[PDB]
Swiss-Prot record, chains A, B:
Changing residue 183 to N: It does not affect the proteolytic activity. DegP can reversibly switch between different oligomeric forms that represent inactive (6-mer) and active (12- and 24-mer) protease states. Substrate binding triggers the conversion of the resting DegP trimer and hexamer into catalytically active 12- and 24-mers. The conversion of 6-mer (DegP6) into 12-mer (DegP12) or 24-mer (DegP24) is crucial in regulating protease activity. It is found in: Cell inner membrane. DegP acts as a chaperone at low temperatures but switches to a peptidase (heat shock protein) at higher temperatures. Degrades transiently denatured and unfolded or misfolded proteins which accumulate in the periplasm following heat shock or other stress conditions. DegP is efficient with Val-Xaa and Ile-Xaa peptide bonds, suggesting a preference for beta-branched side chain amino acids. Only unfolded proteins devoid of disulfide bonds appear capable of being cleaved, thereby preventing non-specific proteolysis of folded proteins. This is Periplasmic serine endoprotease DegP. Changing residue 187 to V: Increases the proteolytic activity. It holds the Pfam family Trypsin_2. Disruption phenotype: Decreased induction of Cpx two-component regulatory system. Increased accumulation of periplasmic accessory protein CpxP, increased accumulation and toxicity of overexpressed, misfolded periplasmic proteins. Increased resistance to hydroxyurea, probably due to decreased degradation of misfolded proteins which eventually leads to decreased OH radical formation. Keywords: Cell inner membrane, Cell membrane, Disulfide bond, Hydrolase, Membrane, Protease, Repeat, Serine protease, Signal, Stress response. Inhibited by diisopropylfluorophosphate (DFP). It comes from Escherichia coli (strain K12). It comes from the Bacteria. One of its GO terms (molecular function) is peptidase activity. Induction: By heat shock. Transcriptionally up-regulated by sigma-E factor and the Cpx two-component signal transduction pathway.
Curated annotation (Swiss-Prot), chain C:
This is Outer membrane porin C. Coiled coil: none annotated. InterPro entries: Gram-neg_bact_OMP (IPR050298), Porin_dom_sf (IPR023614), Porin_gammaproteobac (IPR001897), Porin_Gram-ve (IPR001702), Porin_Gram-ve_CS (IPR013793). Homotrimer. Forms mixed heterotrimers with OmpF and with PhoE; other mixed heterotrimers are also probable. Induction: By growth in high osmolarity conditions (high sugar or salt) under control of OmpR (at protein level). In the presence of 0.2 M NaCl, 2.0 mM sodium cholate (bile salts) decreases expression from the ompC promoter; how this is mediated is unknown. It comes from Escherichia coli (strain K12). Its main location: membrane. It is found in: Cell outer membrane. Residues 95-112 are annotated as: Loop L3. One of its GO terms (biological process) is intermembrane phospholipid transfer. It holds the Pfam family Porin_1. Residues 1-12, 43-52, 81-85, 134-142, 187-190, 228-231, 266-270, 306-309, 346 are periplasmic. Loop L3 (residues 116-133) extends along the inner side of the beta barrel wall and may constrict the pore mid-length.
Amino acid sequence: QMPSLAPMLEKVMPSVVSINVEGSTTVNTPRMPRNFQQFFGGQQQKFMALGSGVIIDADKGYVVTNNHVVDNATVIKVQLSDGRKFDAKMVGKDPRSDIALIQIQNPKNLTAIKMADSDALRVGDYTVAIGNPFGLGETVTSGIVSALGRENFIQTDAAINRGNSGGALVNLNGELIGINTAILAPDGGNIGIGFAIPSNMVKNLTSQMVEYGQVKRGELGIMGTELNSELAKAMKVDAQRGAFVSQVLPNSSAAKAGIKAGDVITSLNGKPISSFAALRAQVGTMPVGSKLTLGLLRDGKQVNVNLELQQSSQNQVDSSSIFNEMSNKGKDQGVVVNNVKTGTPAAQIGLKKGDVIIGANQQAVKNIAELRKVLDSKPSVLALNIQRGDSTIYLL
Amino acid sequence: QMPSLAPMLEKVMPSVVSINVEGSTTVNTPRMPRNFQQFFGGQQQKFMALGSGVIIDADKGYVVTNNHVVDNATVIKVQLSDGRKFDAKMVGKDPRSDIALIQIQNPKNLTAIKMADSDALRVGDYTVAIGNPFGLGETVTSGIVSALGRENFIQTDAAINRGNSGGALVNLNGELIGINTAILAPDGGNIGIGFAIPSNMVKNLTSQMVEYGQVKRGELGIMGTELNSELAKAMKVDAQRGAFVSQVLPNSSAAKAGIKAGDVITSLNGKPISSFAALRAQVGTMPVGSKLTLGLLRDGKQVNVNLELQQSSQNQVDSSSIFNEMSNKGKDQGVVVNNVKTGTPAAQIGLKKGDVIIGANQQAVKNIAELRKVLDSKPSVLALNIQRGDSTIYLL
Amino acid sequence: AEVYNKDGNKLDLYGKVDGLHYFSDNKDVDGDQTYMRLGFKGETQVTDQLTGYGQWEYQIQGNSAENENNSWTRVAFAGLKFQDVGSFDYGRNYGVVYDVTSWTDVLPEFGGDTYGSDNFMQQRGNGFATYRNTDFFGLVDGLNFAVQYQGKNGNPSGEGFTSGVTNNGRDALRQNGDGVGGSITYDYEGFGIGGAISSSKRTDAQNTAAYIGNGDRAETYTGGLKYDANNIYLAAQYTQTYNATRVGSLGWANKAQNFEAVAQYQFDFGLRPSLAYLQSKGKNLGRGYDDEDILKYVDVGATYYFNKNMSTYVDYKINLLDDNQFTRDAGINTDNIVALGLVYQF
């Protein structure tokens, strides 16, 4: 009869799930009355998000999805394409790539998609996207590979006018080639065409979340922008062709090793750095503990140093199956906890600002994958062998 | 050589027509001067509309189209794809589905599309839309079946960025699978993807207009909305999870049988009613004279009753081939006329607010299809055997 | 219409032409009343917090022959606004009492005439220095207050006056000594509540035997209420005045009690009918006048909006004042008036 994508879609759909997130966040307190002819310029607020995800491990119930959907989640629900409902928990997330991993709680008879090799993609190749555009459900749209970046973001015309960046990008064989994302951050929604992380990168970032707790991406800990910013002018910067250092992050390697706002990096390991962009991307091709010597500019300053795990990708209330923001520290040198909060449920448990945890409630916790591997097997007695540098206490 | 949709499009185009509507409406009288820095807050006004339609009966010259195009028409013109021009008259319309039927006056050598079976549609299936996007003519665009609702609105990516909801949705065999619509009422234009009524529903709604004068859809005659509305708050509604009754329609079954604004329906024939939506859709799966008992909420009130034909789908100046708003009454119990107007051309003929017409100017008029079947055969002498309940007069 | 918006400066050029006709037994108001208004509002961004502005509005009568020109400046002021602190402006502007009384000045043609222009701090006038605080440093949404000073506007110069002169002097019915006033309004959702007070020194030219209502100072006290939601507009204001309300050409009222109320509805199809009642009751007037109605009428009208730039209206002033000695002496209109207007605006 007539050609159709329905035959492979039937072998694919069981792997695509819907995701309903419920969570809260801090919003500013509304000042009243409200005057709409007056252009001006803390409380938790619940919000609801919804997106798609792809079953990537049928046994473990591992579902890949966008970080812009599950971010700040308190409750994450998943509904299979056959209608069965499950609960899910955060296992990992990485805001850079806008990719996150979750785990269906109590999976039973699941189907996982097969991942194809991103590296074999070519522009005229056919593409099919599957997502939940406006909430009304699971929509599939078709097209082709528009641009192969060459980070290799995949570009495709199988998008959706005014809709939210769905999820799965699949080839004509039903294999996963990329997860569609949203490059319009803290928004969701597209620029006109579609951007996907390639399947090979998805596989890679995803395994890290599993086997470590987070992705090994080191940060230079500087924060800044281009040489056009109001501050590059309001501070008049000499020789403009590089990355403007607006501030050096606290307790960072840039901070520790030496550097101060103003200097404009001009190179990284000999190579020219013409824009924060160039730099932000280059430092992203280097895993923790790496050493990268870069040239700065004040009069003619330059240094060499080693970076540590970034702070963007971190964990929260999913390490201890219970409930309560740690992350990994250097190589397999335990799990270092970061900025504690105000509610202080975890600080209340004797955990400060820089407390490592090499003791797996008794054993070795070189990382959050392991640590969490124990706070899931023996939920009975828990004594966190934490040692924030000196103090080696054992709280419950 | 190379594949192409041109070969089937050539067998399809003769069935697609263009439609030019001319008509008027009531607009408010402009207050002058005009101050664009002052956000404020009867006369007929001519307007022009244009859309596409599909020839569905070559002999009778029956063309299906959107109700948002022909609504309020005074003059409706049709131009075939070969360029022949004709006049058309309203035969039916149904605002819910946004579907309307018209008849080419004096057809000669027409081609009708074959309708395929909507029920056999599947998501990866290929789709082709044909319409008049910006007026500039007849545009065809292609794609696939995105979502099969499952009312079964069909969702497809063969739409158009910023254009008006065209008309025909056809499969790769040139058969009609759906008529594209506009879910952005009293606007036309899409949300980002395309919504079509399925061909099987089109066939069904369309035959009703032919063989009855209108579609048999009973209304519960309540009007209201959700439990979020300003009135659900400004009136503080207890137990919020249902349909808010803002008002009970006059001379209605809800009115007649018993009900008053405020009560929030909680169920319909035992089943839960969590939103006006749910309810508006459920009452739409029930033809006139049906009986549906529903539970209300005031303190704990509930009733049972039978509904009558809705008022949205009605007729006007097309029943009497002449010129001048009736509709059907219950089963084949004549044709009941509704709200007369101000110009009073038909009221001037001895027709009040509730005047039935069982007399076909001599015969049986159980319905508008029949009635109109007579005011078209014998346009000589006309005596309307109308009886508005008691008075059984015979006007000309 | 915004005709300029570039590099942080905006200019809005606006106006209207009101083709207008009065029908009345009173031939002094009867006939062609056509007029136009023109204006500009400009704003310039100084910093992210500080904005400068200016506004000017002018009325030119369109009902005279070409050998004369009847035109005037309604407002003309410059100001500064600071985000979440307040604004200040100086020039010809509205008195702060109008912050409250403006709420009932919404009728198609008539209304807003328990007071007038150049009438102490009650409506438009010269030399207003006005300070305003919106939303209380942005910490109480909807709460606004204002404090205002008016400098003396005295006798004309170059006319042989030996006291009380100012450069921009005028007739005594339009003079004022130094004045101070204040207003507070609060608007929550659709509702509004407000109050205002003004106190102006009266000049020697005003306190002569040629005028009734002699007094050291002119004072006004105003309360107002408003509802504006769901296509319904309701408002009322009550004002008590002392040596402040004009009694036609006679001078001023020793005490007056003014009341205005309006009800309006906006239909979806563009029609906006309006019903209003206004009265001004004067007391202890002098010269044997004793207690008299200065103003009393019911106003019924409607506006039809074709869009935001074109409208037409009819307003019917049913005048409840009776023709008596007092109204004759003061020159107060006691006849009904029907107005018909057609308005283009930009």
